[PDB]
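Hi W.,

Here's what went into the run:
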Amino acid sequence: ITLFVLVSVVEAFIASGITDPYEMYKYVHVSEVGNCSGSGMGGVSALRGMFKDRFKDEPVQNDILQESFINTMSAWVNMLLISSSGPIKTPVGACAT
Amino acid sequence: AMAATATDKIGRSVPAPGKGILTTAREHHSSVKYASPNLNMKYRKRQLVTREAQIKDWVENELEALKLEAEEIPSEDQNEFLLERTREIHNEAESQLRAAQQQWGNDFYKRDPRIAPLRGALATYGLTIDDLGVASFHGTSTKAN
Amino acid sequence: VTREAQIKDWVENELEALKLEAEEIPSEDQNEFLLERTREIHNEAESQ
Amino acid sequence: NKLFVSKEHAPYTDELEEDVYLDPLARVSKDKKSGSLTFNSKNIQSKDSYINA
Amino acid sequence: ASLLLHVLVAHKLKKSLDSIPMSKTIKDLVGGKSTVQNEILGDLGKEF
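Here's what came out:
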């Protein structure tokens, strides 16, 4: 799910003619670019590795807990692309997030 | 009196703590010779009081024009033309007043770069930075945090 | 548009009182007393 | 296949990180050497960014 | 000790032992993920 999100954040900046995210920081302060994207469940795959793939002693990462969280999608977005210190409010709205 | 969220910076460690939230103290010190009248409550209050009066005769002036509209075009079923209208005038009046209260009392520092969010948050109540007595730390008991 | 005008001579009226403050108490290092202050007036004006 | 290009650095050096978070007028400029968008020591807390704002 | 230290650090990183030069350091082989620096560190403790 983080791959879906990453690819669209990229494609969405392209749709906006922002080619380098840091161009925002020509116009705005680091603290005024935010991320309010949200998930219903999301991380559903890491959740399984945590609850089921562990239960079988199958090899599973030591931080699948990281990737199950609804708000680490927005975190990798900011850690790989955006570098903002803006707001980070993450919505769980189920079928309407 | 304030609440903020802030991300950190480019990284690769998700579980890491950062200094994004330090931005709530951001203010610009490139010029700090003479006192900002803006910080001074006595000042702001006067400015408000002027707007208060300014609003006063706006409502008087509006209520005047209503008499001239009723004295010439509406019938003797004038009670609800007068109800619906004066009601609406007093709304707008209070709305303007509320916005003035807002401009000079609540949000005076919003558009000011010399007043940090944390500063002004306290400042609206006549509180100085020194007045923040206690800091409730997260204090996880981890070395990192 | 009424408020716009109302703001207009508020800024004029405020800028007037600034001349009277500088003409009597600040020295010939008046450039930054005037910078910092008029700057702040125009902020408040735009905010209103 | 260059659509996603992971940022391998922040716009601020680590030893400049705090200074940026605290100046509300700090903004990025093209670097000479790298040509990429960074925060300069000369634009963080400057008189010129007060005037220019 | 080369073959044992290599197989263990190439395993925690999931890349063949050709992808890993023993020339490099554990800080560079990780990239930034300090969970995986903490794992390679504690694993070598139980080992040597």
